């Protein structure tokens, strides 16, 4: 099978996944079945126990994933839905190997990093490329492999040697190599240097891998004097240096590689079956490049998270939002509001950060309350829903807001201020939200609810049901532990806030809507992990429709 | 002797010399005698045969230097004038060693890179620190050593091993180590990475040198989360991480190190004699920081060079100009004008680049024609002086303009269009500018005129004589081969353009002034290499005085 | 042209030249024209100023060589005589490059180690392979390139990068790579390790060269478990691991590579024109393997040198001696005798080292006095010739003995004890040996006599003339400064010791013979540098013939 191994340049946050997916999604437009394998040097297995401020938010797979992210980017760009066993971490390999030397399966031979780890790496990447990953039941023909991390450090040492042996066991027509480096320029002056790319190549070539292409991502487009120096010093012909500058939206990244002629390259390098057309599909990639230049009324949410500045804790939501903004031809203005900045305590001690949050939340044409944990933010977010409740600005609750909207509603309408979730204080006189993890055969003890779960819409008066297409059940994914008590439904069996969804059996509800409001939805499932640039997320699409008021206008068409 | 060895971070053009001079010129304000030794890994000996577009302009020393530059920066910041034997290049060492193994002075032993080169390096740096360099006849006490180049490449291999052996032969109280790295951030996003600094340390520590300080120069000032990661990963305490952002003028660079408390550091590290005052001299460094923020009428030259965009071919002039702009409280607006863009040929084929040059030269309140060679630019620059001649905008000719102004004047006034310099065409019917290199005892053949040369002012009616202080002779330096024929003076023994200067004997003139003009000077010597931020260059100071019209107002004071 | 680049393993003294010549001299038996280029990382140019105890004796070429040695080994094994410009040292390159940047031939561009040195290396190796080197006037087809030194150190850094760029500029069919490593075993125990070969490969592959073959030279022949580990860890198939153990004579080294089938390898790798016969010439390499096992009367010299233990100061003579011992079917017993151990002074202070020298010199069936310099040994060697003079044991004087034999003869027969050479004391009342270097046009001052020089035999009664084949002139090479005065011949115009040779003009004599003696020869030329395993050196061949007494028996055949 043809394999493409991208790597890393000087710094980690270049845009590794934006290149590996782009050369993947060009080849998906070529008519090739694609997989993706992300090699990760971080020891930690099963990323789900991260605080999301170090790396980013989780992604969630079908079979129970808690996989990093970058993995999410591949899923969103390629139409692929994945499995959890191609997030191949260093802790995944060692737990696969330390659990074999107690079995004795290496026949008493002492196992060392070479070859008995690097044999287990080049068996892992053979099997995950072999399994189909898309709607067809058929093995693919390429496999874009992302060696994450940087290169030269101690973490990346068992892996580049694992692929050095792999160039020999594979054929040279079956292997490729991309190197995505940085040419940093100092705005302080004006020249543009090529030295960081030279030392990053001789750390790659010094470990026994040679770049086919070399991709120099920087701030500005680079001059032909720079393409000459990288061609002469890094010992590759000038047809393999591909510039990519900092573009405004990531949809320019696939069509910018079309101009630099990488499509016909892998015809000659990899010897893959291709004939040439318009080198991507003209209707669905060059179109939405022009949608992002020519824009309109800057509108359509404020966001209440619980973090400081856009570390990608919420980058997996912002790519889902501008999917919907791609549909309604609006520029989107994502503005973070810290839930600390809505507390009583900040106004007492600092009004510069507090009054700064309200200013944006009162002018907000839409709120969004995504998921979170812990006591931070929760007491601040309790006022944000009720502000949206009375003054009727639409919002969506995701995995925490659905908990918090049912808390505030009994406090306001039913005057039951004593009620709260059992997340925080177990001494609950009215335990309105109870813990109940899935007690399944094959799952011992308390196991977090995870994976694809069917949930059926009960009754017709849902604005969500018309958005998915009036199908009875939807198929979504979530990672949360807590539910409103089905006994505690008795408290709200008459109001305007009634529960809509039910799963296969019916022991939880997962979905709320409110009558006397434009658009009041709160869901337990994360509706971000199926959002694609072609069809947006159906809760998020209506949420921007409610912000522009065209939500009734979308259902005038129907039909 | 206490030695400070700065190095290099990721890319070459960080600001190595701006840090090594700054920690030098803090210690000069401490009351310590300073030298400077710049280690250069480039094989080429005696930089003077450079095209000035690869590296920059030359510097010229007293004894006959053709030394790079960075060396010039030390000279200008420290009051030091240097010798040519501390520009210690790789070609200087090998020519010092290959000329010893024919002598047999290694006693028949085969010489290899270690130790017999690295012995010759640590004897070179011992001797150049030992020689006095300033007005006192006394050995200094520190020696700021600049290991130029970057680190990790093949050129820098004989030198870091040369200083690894040097930490043992010296005492730990006598040695220091600075590392000036880059933390590149991508404006494309917003985070700030620390990885390039980590790999640059483990290439330095992997060659056997440990940083005392670590200096992270970048675009923006960096947050305490970045100072924590560099302290924890690069294994130095957080008192040795010093931030320096891209500041507007280089005079902030000494006073910004004062805020980060590096003055008291070397009291504890190097054990040098110091008591504390205001940590620099309050009148002459923090004052001119405020001169550059608060500014005035944006005026005071256009420049006609012969190059494209400000590669530092003329950075050794621009630092001399804003010395004078530091004196007259004016912002300076250096605008390059290519001499190609004044030719007849560009207007025929492209008026976008041609008309763009004139636009700036007609609004120019002052022209400047610095030195150059070859047929490029010369035919273009012939119109620039005559444009300044008739319409009377002041300019200065430096080492080529003095040739070109005497050419145009016989063509215009004396109608001798046949005359030209013997630089370009030897078939000269009127050879107005003749070749005559110095034929000296000890100098065989044609040797370029070079070094400090006395030149005496003949007569009183010079506007230059009042600027230097009415001394009879001035002491300047130049590197040029050509002179107007002393026989050809007969052509101009009556006009308004008469020759002013004479050297010790009188076989050349070196200096012109024109009567019916505000300020018309052309000099063979380079008046850039003595310009300091305290007293500017005396031709360049009057040139900005003529631009603002206060040139008469400067001599109203006198006295 | 097909190029083979051998390298180095862990330690320097493996046997680099014994492998590179052997794969050369197999291909010479294949019917291919061969050159040789030895890359040397030692800075010193023109090895001739060595003390011969660091590296070894010199070799002397035709055009004036003072080249190391290993070069001598190629000459002796291949029938090739060389030029001095393929001893390409590091000091040869830099003196070729520092003498070009004063010319300006790099067009003002700053030259660095990459590429402008490595361009000059891959132009040097192109030209020396291009020039013919053998009796034909035709370019060869292979070029065995010896990258001397080891690999990984600082000296070998400009060269392995110089050949990494060379694999791309050449074609993969035109390039090869040998790696000659050590597998050290400890007699202390018994196992045999493969670790030093693994780390030596990943320092070679880490610099961008891959071994075609891998040659493991050690003490014992190695087991198939060792060939499996080197095949699996060093990532080459088990057909390219070639064992070679410590063999008794170096003539087994070509025929041992025949058994391991490297002849058919380069047919497949290099794509060179070959058909197969007996894979070497059966009459002249496998024959003299059996000559060295089956041997005879252990006889046939003691040697008086001036050194301690057989550092190869005299290895260029011992290979010439066992050429003659290959002809007379005798085992040779080379025993060193220090000339210190024949002095008066050692017997006074130590008789353990003194009496140990005489014991071997009185039982000596032949003496040999090779070349040397300085006051050490000279006063000791004066008794060794007179011991050979009276008691009539044959010897040969080489470049110093010819001086010393003419000194002792006037002291003994003519009773002129006052006479001595002008090498040591210039106050000579009878200056019997005078200095006269060649004063040639194109050679300024005192230049050492060097290169091929014709010398004609005057008269018939020479035992040397019958050995060369009664040709009038012979063609030999030497490096010496001193001659007997042609005026001082008047002292010996009647004795039994008369001068035999004369060059083209006749101002020196170069050759002595004595009548009343079996074999008394002393020559100024070095007769070691033409000795080949087929025909021995004609003075050295008769010297072993005089030791066995068959010297008359050789001339009974004639004819
Ligand atoms: N072409 C681009 N131009 C500007 N910004 C980009 C581009 N590609 C990606 N980015 C932004 O930079 C960040 C880094 O990109 P990406 O997540 O693909 O790298 P990654 O290798 O997956 O990260 P990690 O190494 O943490 O897994 C992303 O959050 C994205 O928003
Ligand atoms: N603190 C600073 N902020 C912004 N720009 C700077 C600073 N210091 C220096 N520069 C600019 O960047 C350039 C590089 O500085 P400098 O010449 O000191 O480096 P260098 O090591 O001497 O260069 P080279 O390695 O070529 O000798 C200079 O031309 C200068 O104008
Ligand atoms: N196959 C062999 N077995 C045993 N000894 C050998 C063998 N080949 C060479 N030697 C001996 O070991 C010494 C080293 O061999 P050789 O001179 O070929 O190495 P070299 O690389 O030329 O040395 P240098 O690196 O100093 O030039 C020689 O003096 C020779 O006598
Ligand atoms: O996609 C990736 C790739 C790599 N990594 C992991 O990040 C590490 C490299 O991390 P960085 O290079 O980003 O540096 P750092 O985390 O130490 O500090 P910052 O610069 O982020 O402020 C690697 O050790 C790798 O395990 C990720 O977390 N995500
Ligand atoms: O002050 C210095 C320092 C170093 N150098 C020399 O510059 C080389 C490093 O040069 P660079 O790191 O700047 O890269 P480059 O010249 O190959 O191409 P650009 O990035 O400039 O476009 C080093 O090999 C060193 O010899 C200088 O010229 N001046
Ligand atoms: O054939 C050669 C090869 C290499 N060399 C030169 O020898 C050096 C390697 O020398 P060694 O590896 O032999 O170590 P050393 O000389 O320092 O000390 P000993 O082990 O000999 O006792 C290299 O730096 C190279 O320049 C030779 O002299 N002759």
Indicate whether A271 and A342 sit together in one domain: no
| Cα–Cα distance for residue pair B308/B312, rounded to 1 Å | 11
Sheet with C175-177, edge to edge strand ranges = C87-89, C36-40, C142-147, C2-6, C175-177
Task: Say yes or no for a CB contact (<8 Å) between A219 and B187.
Answer: yes
Give CA–CA dist B197/B204, Å, rounded.
Answer: 11
Residue of C40, C71, C24, C14 lying closest to C200 (CA atoms): C14
Contact A13 B191 (CB under 8 A): yes
Among all ligands shown, which has an atom nearest to the Cα of B149?
5
Phi first, then psi: what are they for B166, rounded to 5°? -80, -20
**CA B60 – CA B525 distance, rounded (Å):** 11
Distance CA B366, CA B362 (A): 10
Using CB atoms, which residue from A165, A207, A235 is nearest to C235?
A: A165
> How many angstroms separate the Cα of C448 from the Cα of each of B102, C49, C317?
14, 12, 22
For residue A452, what are the domain limits?
295-559
- Report the Cα–Cα distance between both ends of chain C, in Å, rounded: 46
Q: For ligand 4, what atom is nearest to the CA of residue A38?
A: 1
Closest residue in B to C103 (Cα) is B49
* Ligand found nearest the CA of A73: 1
Q: Is there a single domain that holds both residue A323 and residue A350?
A: yes
List, in sequence order, every residue forming a beta bridge with A559; answer none if it has no partner: none
Strands B482-484 and B443-447, how do they pair? unpaired
Phi, psi of C160 (to 5 degrees): -70, -30
Closest CA to B11 of B133, B113, B130, B153: B153
Residue A230 beta carbon below 6 angstroms from any ligand 5 atom? no
| Cα–Cα dist B331/B294, whole Å | 9
Contact B322, B332 (CB under 8 A): yes
By three-state DSSP, how is residue A333 classified? coil
How many other C-beta atoms can be found within 10 angstroms of the C-beta atom of residue B15? 20
Are B153 and B126 contacting, i.e. CB atoms less than 8 angstroms apart? Answer: no
Q: Cβ(A366)–Cβ(A547) under 8 Å?
A: yes
* Rounded Cα gap, residues A357 and A354, in angstroms: 5
Show Cβ contacts of residue B288 under 8 Å, excluding neighbours closer than 6 positions. Answer: B251, B326, B533
Q: How many helices (H) and strands (E) does chain A have?
A: 18, 23
Q: Using the beta-carbon criterion (under 8 Å), do C91 and B107 form an inter-chain contact?
A: no
Domain shared by A279 and A311, yes or no: no
Helix (H) or strand (E) holding B522: strand B520-523
What value does the CA radius of gyration of chain B take, rounded to a whole number of Å? 25
- For residues A287 and A299, state if they share a domain: no
**Whether the CB of A150 sits within 6 Å of ligand 4:** yes
Q: What are the distances in angstroms from CA C84 to CA A458, C55, C69, C133?
A: 96, 18, 12, 11
- Distance of alpha carbon A197 from alpha carbon A208, whole angstroms: 17
| φ, ψ for residue C30, nearest 5 deg | -75, -20
A219: closest chain B residue by CA: B188
Q: Is C63 in the pocket of ligand 3 (CB under 6 A)?
A: no
Instruction: Round to whole Å and give the CA distance between A540 and A527.
Output: 8
**Could you tell me which residues are beta bridge partners of residue C4?**
C144, C176
Q: At what angle do helices B118-130 and B157-169 cross, to 10 degrees?
A: 60
Q: Which of C261, C294, C327 is the last residue of a domain?
A: C294
Number of Cβ within 10 Å of residue C415's Cβ equals 8
Q: What is the 3-state secondary structure (H, E, C) of C218-235?
A: CCCCCCHHHHHHHHHHCC
Q: Where are the beta strands (DSSP E) in A419-472?
A: 419-421, 430-435, 438-440, 443-447, 452-457
Look at residues A103, A73, A70, A104 and name the one whose alpha carbon lies nearest to residue A89: A70
Strands C180-182, C214-217: parallel, antiparallel or unpaired by DSSP? Answer: parallel
Phi, psi torsion values for C15, nearest 5 degrees: 125, 40
Q: How many angstroms separate the CA atoms of B508 and B356, rounded?
A: 38
CB of residue B205 inside a 6 A radius of ligand 5: no
Do the beta carbons of residue B176 and residue B269 sit within 8 Å?
yes
The Cα C475–Cα C455 span in angstroms is 7
> Under a CB-based contact definition with an 8 Å cutoff, are residues C289 and C252 in contact?
yes
CB A14 within 8 A of CB A182: yes
What's the token pair of residue B374? 């070859």
Distance from CA of A207 to the nearest CA of C (A): 6
Cα separation, B198 vs B179, in Å, equals: 11
Is the link from the previous residue into B559 a cis peptide, with omega within 30 of 0?
yes
DSSP letters, A363-432, are S-S-EEE----SSTTHHHHHHHHHHHHHS---EEEESSHHHHHHHHHHHHTS--TTEEETTT-S--SEEE
What gap in Å lies between CA B52 and CA C249, rounded to an integer?
Answer: 61
Q: What value, to the nearest 5°, has the Cα angle with vertex C123 and ends C122 and C129?
A: 90
Q: Give A10's contacts (C-beta < 8 A, 6+ positions apart).
A: A150, A181, A182, A184, A196, A197, A200, B10, B184, B195, B196, B199
Strand runs labelled E in C7-151? 36-40, 87-89, 142-147
What are the DSSP E strand ranges found in B258-372? 303-305, 336-338, 367-369
Is residue A240 within 8 Å of residue A214, measured between CB atoms? yes
In this complex, the residue of B91, B101, B154 whose CB is nearest that of residue C49 is B101
Which residue from C114, C165, C205 is facing A208, i.e. has the nearest CB? C205
Interface test with C, best of B41, B89, B97, B108 (most C CBs within 10 A): B108
Whether C247 and C270 map to the same domain: the answer is: yes
Other CB atoms closer than 10 Å to residue B95's CB: what's the count?
17
Buried-exposed string B46-83: b where 16+ CB fall within 10 A, e elsewhere: bbbbbebeebbbbbbbeebbbbbbbbbbbbbbbebbbb
Using an 8 Å CB-CB cutoff, list chain B residues near A150. 195, 199
Beta partners for C434?
C483
Query: Among residues B401, B374, B375, B372, which one has the least CA distance to residue B386?
Result: B401
- Beta pairing class for C443-447 and C438-440: antiparallel
- Final resolution, Å: 3.5
Give the HSE-up count for residue A528: Cα atoms under 13 Å, Cβ half-sphere.
28
Residue B310: DSSP 8-state: -
Q: What order of strands is seen across the sheet that includes strand B214-217?
A: B180-182, B214-217, B241-244
Rounded to whole angstroms, how far apart are CA atoms C285 and C252? 8
Do B226 and B343 lie in one domain? The reply is no
Question: Could you tell me the distance, in angstroms and rounded to a whole number, from the CA of residue A237 to the centre of ligand 5?
Answer: 22
* Chain position carrying tokens 């050095």: A164
User: What token pair was written down for C75?
Assistant: 């000459």
* 3-state class percentages of chain A: helix first, strand second, coil last, to nearest 5: 35, 20, 45
Q: What's the angle, vertex CA B222, arms to CA B218 and CA B227, rounded to 5?
A: 110
Question: Quick one: chain B helix, strand, coil %, rounded to 5?
Answer: 35, 20, 45
Q: What is the dihedral of CA B305, B308, B314, B320, to 10 degrees?
A: 80
Domain boundary among A294, A311, A343: A294
- Read off the tokens for A171: 């054929």
Q: What is the CATH number of the domain that holds B125?
A: 3.40.50.300
DSSP state of C501: E
Q: Give the integer Cα–Cα distance in Å for C74 and C37.
A: 10
Cβ-count burial A247-270 (b if 16+ within 10 Å, e if not): eeebbbbbbbbbebebbebbeebb
CA neighbor of C371 nearest in space, from C449, C442, C430, C294: C449
Mutate to test the pocket of ligand 1, among A5, A12, A15, A182 (most ligand atoms within 8 A of CB): A15
Question: Is B57 known to be catalytic?
Answer: no
Per-residue DSSP letters for C269-286?
HT------SSSS-TTTSS
Q: Do B316 and B440 belong together in one domain?
A: yes
State chain A's maximal CA–CA distance in angstroms.
76
Q: Are A72 and A56 in contact (CB under 8 A)?
A: no
DSSP state of A43: -
CA geometry: angle A42, A43, A44, nearest 5 deg: 95
Give the whole-angstrom CA distance, residue C136 versus residue A208. Answer: 43
Peptide bond into C559 cis (omega under 30): yes
C-beta atoms of A208 and C207 within 8 A: no
Determine the distance from the C-alpha atom of residue B267 to the mean position of all C-alpha atoms in its chain, rounded to a whole number.
31
Tokens of C438: 């060649």
Q: Tell me the angle at which helices A71-78 and A315-327 cross, rounded to the nearest 10 degrees.
A: 20
Contact of B404 with B373, CB cutoff 8 Å? no
Q: Give the tokens for residue A214.
A: 């070399």
> CA angle A507-A510-A513, nearest 5°?
125
SS3 state of residue C49: helix
Q: Which residue has the tokens 């003076």?
A: B489
Q: Which residues of B touch C110 (CB under 8 A)?
A: 42, 44, 47, 50, 54-55
Q: Nearest residue on chain A to B186, judged by CA atoms?
A: A219
The answer to whether B501 and B522 have CB atoms below 8 angstroms apart is: no
Beta strands in A64-213 (DSSP E): 87-89, 142-147, 175-177, 180-182
Angle at CA of residue A466, ends A464 and A472, nearest 5°: 80
Contact A521, A464 (CB under 8 A): yes
**Site of tokens 């305590």:** A345
Residue of C6, C11, C13 best suited for mutating to test ligand 3, as the one with most atoms within 8 Å of CB: C13
Q: What is the number of the ligand 3 atom nearest to the C-alpha of C319?
A: 31
Please, what is the end-to-end C-alpha distance for chain B in angstroms? Answer: 46
- In this structure, the answer to whether residues C318 and C240 fall within a common structural domain is no
Identify the CA nearest to C326 among candidates C315, C337, C338, C318: C318
Helix (H, G, I), strand (E, B), or coil: what is residue A297? Answer: coil
How far apart CA C340 and CA C345 sit, in angstroms, is: 8
- Kindly state the tokens that stand for C277: 């016969």
Q: Could C235 and A207 be called an inter-chain contact, meaning their C-beta atoms sit closer than 8 Å?
A: no
Residue count of chain A = 559
Parallel, antiparallel or unpaired: strands B87-89 and B36-40: parallel
Do the Cβ atoms of A283 and A289 come closer than 8 Å?
no
User: Residue C513 burial by CB count (10 A; 0-12/13-18/19+): exposed, middle or buried?
Assistant: buried
CA distance, residue C460 to nearest chain B CA (Å): 43
From the candidates C108, C156, C445, which should be mutated to test the interface with B, based on the most B CB atoms within 10 A? C108
Residues B348 and B262 in one domain: no
Q: How many C-beta atoms lie closer than 10 Å to residue C459's C-beta?
A: 10
Report how far residue C490's alpha carbon sits from residue B239's, in angstroms, rounded to the nearest whole number.
88
Residue nearest to atom 10 of ligand 1 (CA): A15
CA nearest neighbour of B211 among B173, B241, B248:
B241
Q: Is the CB of A70 under 6 A from ligand 4?
A: yes
In contact, B162 and B112? CB cutoff 8 Å: no
CA-wise closest residue to C510 among C455, C441, C438, C451: C455
Helices C118-130 & C157-169 angle (0-180, nearest 10): 60
C-alpha A33: how far from its chain's center? 21
Which one of B13, B184, B217 has the shortest CB-CB distance to A191? B13
Number of H-type helices and E-type strands within chain B? 18, 23
**∠ CA B354-B359-B365 to the nearest 5 degrees?**
130
CA gap A496, A514 in Å, rounded? 5
What is the 3-class SS of C304-340, one letter each residue?
EECCCCCCCCCHHHHHHHHHHHHHCCCCECCCEEECH
Q: Select the residue from B47, B109, B110 to test the C interface by mutation, using most C Cβ atoms within 10 A.
A: B110
Distance CA A197, CA A212 (A): 15
Q: Provide the 8-state DSSP code for A117.
A: I
Contact criterion met (CB below 8 Å) for A558 and A345: no
Q: Are the C-beta atoms of A500 and A509 separated by less than 8 Å?
A: yes
Residue B357 belongs to domain with CATH number: 3.40.50.880
Scanning C31-172, the segments in alpha helix (DSSP H) are 71-78, 90-98, 118-130, 157-169
Query: Which pair of structure tokens corresponds to residue C140?
Result: 């060869």
Q: Is-contact C128 C3, C-beta < 8 A?
A: no
Rg (CA), chain A: 25
C-beta of residue A176 within 8 angstroms of C-beta of residue A2: yes
Residue A481: CB atoms within 10 A of its CB come to: 16
* CA dist., res. B477 & res. B466, Å (int): 20
The CA distance from B85 to B39, in Å, is 11
Tokens standing for A188?
Answer: 């302080």
Q: Which two tokens stand for residue A484?
A: 């409103």
Verify that B197 and B254 share a domain, yes or no.
Answer: yes
User: Chain A contacts of B42, Cβ < 8 Å?
Assistant: none
| Residues B42 and B117 reside in one and the same domain | yes
Q: Of the candidates A294, A311, A334, which is a domain's last residue?
A: A294
User: Which one of C115, C207, C235 has the shortest CB-CB distance to A168?
Assistant: C235
Both C290 and C377 in one domain: the answer is no
* β partners of residue B503: B455
**Total domains present in chain B:** 2
User: Does residue C299 carry a catalytic annotation?
Assistant: no
Give the integer Cα–Cα distance in Å for A394 and A299.
13
Sequence length of chain B is 559
Residues 6+ apart with CB under 8 A from A51: none
Q: What does the DSSP assignment read for B56-120?
A: ------SSS----STHHHHHHHHS----GGGEEEHHHHHHHHHTTTTTTTTTTPPP-IIIIIHHH
The approach used to solve this structure was cryo-EM
Rounded to 5 degrees, φ, ψ at C498 are -120, 155
Gap between the Cα atoms of B483 and B471, Å rounded:
25
Burial label for A421, CB within 10 Å (0-12, 13-18, 19+), is buried
B-chain CB neighbours of A198 within 8 Å are 153
- The strand order across the sheet containing C180-182 reads C180-182, C214-217, C241-244
| A217's tokens | 């991502």
- Which atom of ligand 2 approaches the CA of B16 most closely? 21
Residue pair B456/B501 in contact (Cβ under 8 Å)? The answer is: yes
Integer CA distances (angstroms), A144 to A39, A128, B110, C301, in order: 11, 11, 53, 73
Cα(A100) to ligand 4 centroid in Å equals 29
């Amino acid at each position: 099978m043809k394999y493409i191994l991208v790597t890393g340049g000087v710094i980690s946050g270049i845009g590794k996944g934006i290149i590996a997916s782009s050369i993947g999604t060009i080849l998906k437009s070529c008519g090739l079945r694609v997989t993706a394998i992300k090699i990760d040097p971080y020891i930690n297995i099963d990323a789900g126990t991260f605080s999301p401020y170090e790396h980013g938010e989780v992604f969630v797979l079908n079979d129970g994933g808690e996989v990093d992210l970058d993995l999410g980017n591949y899923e969103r760009f390629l139409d692929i839905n994945l499995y959890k066993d191609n997030n191949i971490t260093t802790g995944k390999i060692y737990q696969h190997v330390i659990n074999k030397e107690r079995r004795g399966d290496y026949l008493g031979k002492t196992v060392q990093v070479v070859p008995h780890i690097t044999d287990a790496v080049q068996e892992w990447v053979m099997n995950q490329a072999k399994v189909p990953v898309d709607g067809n039941k058929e093995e693919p023909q390429i496999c874009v492999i992302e060696l994450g991390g940087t290169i030269g450090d101690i973490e990346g040492m068992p892996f580049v040697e694992a692929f050095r042996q792999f160039q020999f066991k594979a054929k040279r027509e079956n292997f490729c190599n991309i190197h995505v480096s940085l040419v940093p320029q100092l705005s302080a002056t004006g020249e543009q240097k090529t030295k960081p790319t030279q030392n990053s190549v001789r750390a790659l070539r010094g470990l026994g891998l040679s770049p086919d292409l070399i991709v120099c991502r920087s701030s500005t487009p680079i001059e032909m004097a720079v393409k000459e120096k990288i061609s002469m010093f890094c010992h590759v012909n000038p047809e393999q240096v591909i510039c990519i500058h900092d573009v405004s939206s990531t949809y320019r990244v696939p069509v910018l590689l079309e101009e630099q002629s990488i499509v016909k390259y892998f015809k000659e390098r990899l010897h893959l079956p291709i004939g040439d057309s318009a080198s991507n599909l003209l209707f669905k990639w060059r179109n939405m490049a022009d949608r992002y230049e020519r824009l309109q009324k800057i509108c359509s949410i404020a966001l209440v998270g619980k973090y400081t500045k856009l570390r990608d804790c919420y980058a997996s939501v912002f790519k889902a939002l501008e999917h919907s903004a791609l549909a309604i031809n609006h520029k989107l203005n994502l503005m973070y509001i810290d839930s600390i900045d809505l507390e009583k305590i900040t106004e007492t001690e600092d009004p510069v950060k507090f009054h700064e949050a309200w200013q944006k939340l009162c002018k907000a044409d839409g709120i969004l309350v995504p998921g979170g944990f812990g006591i931070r933010g929760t007491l601040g977010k309790l006022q944000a829903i009720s502000w949206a409740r009375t003054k009727k600005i639409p919002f969506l609750g995701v995995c925490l807001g659905m908990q918090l909207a049912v808390i505030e509603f009994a406090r306001n309408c039913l005057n039951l201020k004593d009620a709260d979730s059992t997340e925080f204080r177990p001494n609950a006189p009215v335990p309105l939200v109870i813990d109940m993890p899935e007690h399944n055969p094959g799952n011992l003890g308390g196991t977090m609810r995870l994976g694809i779960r069917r949930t059926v819409f009960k009754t017709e008066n849902s604005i969500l049901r018309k958005l998915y297409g009036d199908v009875p059940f939807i198929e979504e994914r979530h990672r949360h532990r807590f539910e409103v008590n089905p006994n505690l439904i008795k408290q709200f069996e008459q109001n305007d806030l009634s529960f809509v969804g039910q799963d296969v059996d019916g022991d939880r509800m997962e979905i709320i809507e409110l009558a006397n409001h434009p658009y009041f939805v709160g869901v337990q499932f994360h509706p971000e992990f199926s959002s694609r640039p072609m069809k947006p997320s159906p809760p998020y699409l209506g949420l921007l429709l409610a912000a522009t008021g065209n939500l009734n206008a979308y259902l005038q068409q129907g039909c």
